[PDB]
Amino acid sequence: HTITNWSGTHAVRPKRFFQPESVEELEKIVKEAHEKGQKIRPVGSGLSPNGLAFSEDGMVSLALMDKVLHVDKEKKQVTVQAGARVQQVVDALRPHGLTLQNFASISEQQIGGFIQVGAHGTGARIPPVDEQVVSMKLVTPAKGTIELSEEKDPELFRLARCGLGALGVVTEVTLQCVPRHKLLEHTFVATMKEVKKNHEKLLRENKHVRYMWIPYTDTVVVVTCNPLPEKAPQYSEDEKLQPLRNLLREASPEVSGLSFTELRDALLAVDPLDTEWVKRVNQAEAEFWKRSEGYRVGWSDEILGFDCGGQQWVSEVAFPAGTLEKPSAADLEYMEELMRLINKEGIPAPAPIEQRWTAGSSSPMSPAYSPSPDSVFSWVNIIMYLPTEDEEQRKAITEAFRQYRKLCETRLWDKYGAAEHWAKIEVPEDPEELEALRERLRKRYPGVDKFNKARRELDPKNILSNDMIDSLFP
Ligand SMILES: Cc1cc2nc3c(=O)[nH]c(=O)nc-3n(C[C@H](O)[C@H](O)[C@H](O)COP(=O)(O)OP(=O)(O)OC[C@H]3O[C@@H](n4cnc5c(N)ncnc54)[C@H](O)[C@@H]3O)c2cc1C
Ligand SMILES: O=C1O[C@H]([C@@H](O)CO)[C@H](O)[C@@H]1O
């Protein structure tokens, strides 16, 4: 079994690959893996953009353990085997009239890999998915199967539920659900100025708010979602795509089939590191979005999904933007600086730069860790696309993205106290940078020392961790 992430930027062929169908079977696997000092890193769907779960030596998947065990019809709660995919849990929950509190744009993630990185959606009053776990069962190399909750070692619970697969193998999760609801989704464009005006009130008046920023333009695409009490409040598809189709014809039945995202991919392909060419692609996409204002209605699960496009490099940071009651302007200032920089340094940055918001997490490891609840994090995701399979063109884009991320890395993350998403962080080779990174992790995470202490307490032989984990927590 050879195993590759979504963007095929990372792949691994583990010497050992285990896929147990029962806790009993997994209990054994770790017991024996412990007894022998053999690596077994937990893996979910393997989709993490940075290969977090990848180990040459050994990996365990709970893909076959994916049943919904119990529904508490009253406390609005599902207990689910860790191997269940988000999609699988949305389907099972449907007839029980329940849904998850939030979704992370794709739904192929396993609950394990979903919670272990503190995945998030958007919505200023909605935490990342760590704060959605009531209880978990975790299989430890040292203590065996232990039950965690706000009651059973709540100190460990919060450190475990977001443990980057390093504190044990999660077998069960009880999740705080909300009632299955339809959602009204509003898409519109705006200027920086128009954003700044309605921003503070927009976050607070709208359940979900996401901004797609389009570099080398003053077009920001805003997407609000709110529950439909009772329903929905024009350009043709051909007319929406005309600018991108017209731009590609400059440099057909080949074209007429391509989706909006295939056109971007096919446009970027032409010359993805020439900044002037990207200027033109981004302007055309801005026009598309200008021709795509409107409303949709659907179930939260259908609406909070987002088509992310082709294979890609991405980097998302979570940084503090005050509290509900004391608004901050870090979030829009962050964006101003970043768009000042891309122009100043001639970065061939395609669209979109995705800015979202979450409530704080009580999970020490969450990149939106706050002691104060009703705190607010802005998340900002940068992207370069890999439109083709030319390893040549794919290594220039890899270069340029590292430089793009590196420039944010210095100029912004320190200033704003920005912590990287656990699924997107890349361990740099240059030993300067790795020590540079390490001092930043300490700087942004108080619970670090306590996290390696739980690693020795629960996995003293270190069979659950890979190079990545060792390099980040030395
Ligand atoms: C196209 C795309 C869009 C995305 N959008 C979002 C988004 O909107 N929001 C967001 O927050 N993230 C997003 N992500 C990132 C994604 O949520 C994470 O990569 C997620 O962790 C993937 O889940 P997985 O099951 O594939 O995890 P894997 O990559 O398989 O594993 C993730 C982590 O969990 C551990 N693990 C997995 N299963 C278990 C288990 N049973 N017990 C213990 N540890 C376990 C692994 O060791 C690893 O540390 C996106 C990724 C892609 C590719
Ligand atoms: O990993 C991710 O990929 C998407 C991004 O590519 C948006 O274009 C999600 O928003 C998330 O940040």
Side-chain angles (χ1 to χ4, degrees), residues 1-325 327-343 345-474:
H1 196 46
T2 190
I3 295 189
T4 304
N5 67 351
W6 172 279
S7 285
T9 58
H10 285 95
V12 71
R13 218 205 335 114
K15 271 135 201 153
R16 297 175 301 279
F17 187 76
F18 304 92
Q19 222 157 30
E21 290 169 335
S22 65
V23 162
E24 301 78 27
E25 272 184 46
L26 172 71
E27 274 168 357
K28 163 182 140 147
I29 287 160
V30 180
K31 264 221 286 206
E32 296 181 354
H34 200 70
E35 290 173 4
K36 300 190 167 68
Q38 294 184 143
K39 296 307 200 148
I40 44 145
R41 193 138 166 75
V43 62
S45 291
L47 303 176
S48 277
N50 65 1
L52 196 57
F54 289 6
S55 161
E56 265 205 63
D57 301 309
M59 291 164 62
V60 45
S61 162
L62 297 210
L64 300 187
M65 296 156 78
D66 50 28
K67 295 173 169 215
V68 171
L69 303 182
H70 174 56
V71 192
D72 187 299
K73 292 177 191 182
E74 233 182 353
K75 279 131 69 87
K76 290 167 167 44
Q77 279 176 16
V78 73
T79 292
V80 58
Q81 302 196 287
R85 284 174 291 269
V86 171
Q87 190 58 57
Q88 290 185 308
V89 167
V90 158
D91 293 340
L93 273 183
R94 171 173 305 113
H96 284 79
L98 279 171
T99 192
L100 315 168
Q101 210 181 315
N102 219 349
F103 304 93
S105 103
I106 63 157
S107 76
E108 301 130 84
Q109 293 93 336
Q110 301 193 2
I111 298 309
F114 192 53
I115 71 168
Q116 282 296 297
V117 306
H120 72 92
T122 187
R125 304 166 193 284
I126 299 165
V129 311
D130 338 54
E131 207 64 48
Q132 313 189 174
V133 189
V134 179
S135 67
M136 56 180 322
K137 294 175 186 178
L138 180 60
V139 172
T140 64
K143 330 314 186 79
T145 298
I146 49 168
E147 198 168 313
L148 296 192
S149 91
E150 276 313 310
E151 311 199 326
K152 296 178 211 197
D153 199 344
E155 165 148 31
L156 188 51
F157 179 41
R158 298 186 219 257
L159 201 58
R161 69 195 179 175
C162 189
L164 309 178
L167 304 193
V169 184
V170 179
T171 62
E172 239 168 286
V173 173
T174 299
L175 291 168
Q176 189 68 78
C177 304
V178 310
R180 183 158 175 267
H181 64 279
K182 294 227 167 134
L183 271 182
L184 173 67
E185 185 214 50
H186 191 204
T187 313
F188 64 100
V189 300
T191 71
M192 173 54 84
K193 274 218 299 195
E194 305 202 3
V195 165
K196 271 197 274 237
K197 179 166 153 151
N198 315 304
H199 182 78
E200 160 187 306
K201 305 178 171 192
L202 197 65
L203 291 199
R204 304 181 163 74
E205 287 181 72
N206 289 283
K207 189 172 169 36
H208 312 274
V209 173
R210 144 176 83 79
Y211 296 173
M212 285 190 281
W213 301 86
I214 306 174
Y216 299 127
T217 78
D218 195 12
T219 309
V220 195
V221 185
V222 183
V223 188
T224 75
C225 305
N226 302 278
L228 189 85
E230 232 320 308
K231 304 166 195 201
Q234 199 224 322
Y235 302 93
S236 88
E237 290 310 310
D238 291 320
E239 188 156 22
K240 288 159 192 208
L241 300 165
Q242 175 182 218
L244 306 156
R245 288 172 168 174
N246 287 1
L247 184 66
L248 192 37
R249 276 152 201 180
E250 278 191 33
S252 174
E254 174 91 48
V255 177
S256 50
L258 294 188
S259 83
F260 164 68
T261 56
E262 284 158 49
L263 286 174
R264 186 161 57 202
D265 283 342
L267 275 170
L268 288 176
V270 169
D271 202 7
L273 300 157
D274 172 8
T275 311
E276 290 303 301
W277 174 249
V278 164
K279 287 203 172 189
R280 300 198 57 191
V281 175
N282 288 4
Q283 267 132 26
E285 160 162 4
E287 288 310 292
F288 161 89
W289 279 117
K290 277 164 193 192
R291 295 178 179 189
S292 285
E293 314 186 77
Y295 292 78
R296 297 160 64 213
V297 166
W299 304 98
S300 45
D301 66 279
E302 286 145 12
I303 296 295
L304 298 168
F306 164 77
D307 202 284
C308 295
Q311 295 188 331
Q312 52 197 66
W313 283 104
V314 288
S315 162
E316 191 183 49
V317 303
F319 54 82
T323 62
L324 293 183
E325 267 194 7
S328 186
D331 48 10
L332 294 188
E333 277 149 31
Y334 190 106
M335 286 307 318
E336 283 173 63
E337 288 211 53
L338 177 56
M339 299 284 243
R340 264 183 250 130
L341 208 76
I342 284 161
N343 273 265
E345 311 269 333
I347 303 175
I353 304 188
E354 196 130 282
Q355 184 177 34
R356 301 180 271 172
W357 294 267
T358 77
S361 179
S362 71
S363 305
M365 290 313 290
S366 168
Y369 173 59
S370 202
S372 10
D374 309 352
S375 82
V376 181
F377 285 73
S378 188
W379 304 68
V380 170
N381 183 100
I382 70 183
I383 186 151
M384 288 186 155
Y385 296 92
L386 309 155
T388 66
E389 298 288 63
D390 180 358
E391 50 181 317
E392 189 107 313
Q393 189 208 247
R394 281 185 70 114
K395 276 159 185 175
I397 293 160
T398 310
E399 287 279 6
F401 184 70
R402 267 180 52 262
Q403 299 169 267
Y404 176 22
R405 191 188 49 239
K406 177 61 157 159
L407 293 157
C408 307
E409 213 213 316
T410 76
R411 308 290 170 74
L412 301 168
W413 294 355
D414 260 36
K415 161 163 191 163
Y416 284 99
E420 280 175 281
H421 199 287
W422 285 125
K424 305 188 208 177
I425 193 160
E426 294 288 334
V427 171
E429 258 98 0
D430 195 289
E432 163 215 27
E433 293 178 318
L434 174 44
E435 191 45 55
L437 171 49
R438 282 160 186 211
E439 291 206 333
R440 291 175 185 186
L441 294 187
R442 313 215 82 238
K443 259 154 212 63
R444 287 163 200 168
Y445 294 97
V448 161
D449 270 26
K450 283 205 152 162
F451 173 66
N452 223 296
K453 201 201 188 206
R455 263 178 76 193
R456 291 185 308 272
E457 278 158 32
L458 293 154
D459 174 43
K461 297 199 128 189
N462 206 37
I463 54 163
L464 293 182
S465 309
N466 53 2
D467 295 6
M468 181 146 297
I469 289 302
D470 303 322
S471 305
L472 299 178
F473 317 116

